[PDB]
Write a protein that binds this ligand. Structure first.
Ligand code: W77
Ligand code: ZN
Ligand code: ZN
Length: 174
């Protein structure tokens, strides 16, 4: 197994997957680490049991899906893919807003809040989770305006959207 956490790329107290070489800090894995198979492996198993699950889907259909166990897992995995990027640090904890010329967002949002919401089964459809995630980056874009720091929101949103399209097998388009 790997000697660093798959998510944050640091050593430490690591838990090793039994069905692949990946390792995780306890609370870097999502869900928190409970033989044992990691979320990458569990996601692969879903695909292997239903090959047609990889055919293209419409985003509008995906968003309306109820959060049954497989969709819950896929959202957990998508959230984890965002934390895998080091730039997720800017969006992980609760933000505060005091900048000349700007007003904070009406509904603040951050990755650890989405993590807690998933853990507490607060989302009944995929749409709820995706709306909160997109809100993180939209809030950031609106607040920082013309500061070059706005680009961090564009960058991390791109990671979210690419992984959303992959994990939920969104139909490819030009
Ligand atoms: O962050 C977390 N836990 C943690 C524990 C100890 C050191 N660092 C981080 C955590 C765990 C579970 C959930 Cl649902 C949300 C969070 Cl936000
Ligand atoms: Zn880690
Ligand atoms: Zn694994």
């Amino acid at each position: 197994n790997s000697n660093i956490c798959e998510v944050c790329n640091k050593w430490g107290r690591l838990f090793c997957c039994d069905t692949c070489p990946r390792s995780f800090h306890e609370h870097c894995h999502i869900p928190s680490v409970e033989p044992w198979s990691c979320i990458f492996c569990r996601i692969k198993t879903i695909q292997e049991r239903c090959p047609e699950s990889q055919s293209g889907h419409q985003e509008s259909e995906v968003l309306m899906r109820q959060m049954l166990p497989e969709e819950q897992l896929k959202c957990e995995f998508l959230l984890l893919k965002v934390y895998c990027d080091s730039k997720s640090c800017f969006f992980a904890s609760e933000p505060y807003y005091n900048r000349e010329g700007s007003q904070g967002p009406q509904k603040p949002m951050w990755l650890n809040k989405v993590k807690t919401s998933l853990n507490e089964q607060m989302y009944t459809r995929v749409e709820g989770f995706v709306q909160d995630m997109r809100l993180i980056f939209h809030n950031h874009k609106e607040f920082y305006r013309e500061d070059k720091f706005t680009r961090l929101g564009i960058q991390v949103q791109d990671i979210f959207e690419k992984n959303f399209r992959n994990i939920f097998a969104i139909q490819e388009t030009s």
